[PDB]
Amino acid sequence: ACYCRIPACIAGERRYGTCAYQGRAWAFCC
Amino acid sequence: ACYCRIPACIAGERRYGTCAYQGRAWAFCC
Amino acid sequence: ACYCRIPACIAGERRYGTCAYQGRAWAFCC
Amino acid sequence: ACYCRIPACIAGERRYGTCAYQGRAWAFCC
């Protein structure tokens, strides 16, 4: 699955983009 | 976790954005 | 993490997009 | 599995596209 994470992805996940939601930029991570 | 859905996110989810694939726009729901 | 798979996502993976590589479409699976 | 890397893919991966996050562009590699 994928996640929107603040402030970065977590160990074992990779970043592929950015979620833009509630005035924050979240890492798009899977 | 987040999922692409049509027509809508499911009770309990938040629409964080939009996916695009197979000719369609999808709710991206986390 | 994410794979660009043909023909389908595998096992617990779900689709988030479409990879395109010189005319070939792949499922973006994560 | 696919990843986003600067400045290019690790030799052996194919460049399937471009990622954009954190204000930078990355090779999308699988």
Residue numbers in the entry:
A (entry chain B), B (entry chain C), C (entry chain A), D (entry chain D): 1 to 30
Provide the publication's sentences verbatim.
Defensins are a family of antimicrobial peptides of innate immunity broadly active against bacteria, viruses and toxins. They are small (2–5 kDa), stabilized structurally by three disulfide bonds, form oligomers, and are divided into α, β and θ structural classes. The canonical dimer interface of HNP1 is formed by the antiparallel extensions of the β2 strands stabilized by the reciprocal main-chain hydrogen bonds contributed by Thr18 and Ile20, and the hydrophobic packing of the side chains of Tyr16, Tyr21, Trp26, Phe28 and the Cys2–Cys30 and Cys4–Cys19 disulfides. Further analysis of probable quaternary structures by the Protein Interfaces, Surfaces and Assemblies (PISA) software indicates that the HNP1 dimer forms a tetramer or dimer of dimers in a crystal.
I20A/L25A-HNP1 crystallizes as a tetramer with two independent tetramers in the asymmetric unit of the crystal. The RMSD between tetramers is 0.744 Å. Unlike wild type HNP1 and most other HNP1 mutants, the tetramer I20A/L25A-HNP1 is not formed as a dimer of dimers. Each monomer contributes equally to tetramer stability with a combined buried surface area of approximately 2760 Å2 (as compared to 2280 Å2 of the wild type HNP1 tetramer). Tyr16 and Phe28 make up the bulk of the hydrophobic core with contributions from Tyr21 and the adjacent disulfide bonds of Cys4–Cys19 and Cys2–Cys30. In addition, there are two core sets of hydrogen bonds in the tetramer center that help in its stability, utilizing main chain atoms from Ala1, Cys2, and Cys30 and the hydroxyl of Tyr16. The tetramer is further stabilized by a hydrogen bond between Arg14 and Tyr21 of one pair of subunits. In the present study, we also discovered novel quaternary structures in the crystal, including a form of I20A-HNP1 that appears to be unable to form dimers or tetramers and a novel tetrameric form of I20A/L25A-HNP1. LF inhibition was less than 2-fold different than wild-type for the single mutants and about 2-fold different for the I20A/L25A double mutant, as measured by IC50 values. In the virtual colony count assay, whereas the I20A and L25A mutations each made a significant difference against S. aureus, they did not make a significant difference against E. coli or B. cereus even in the I20A/I25A double mutant.
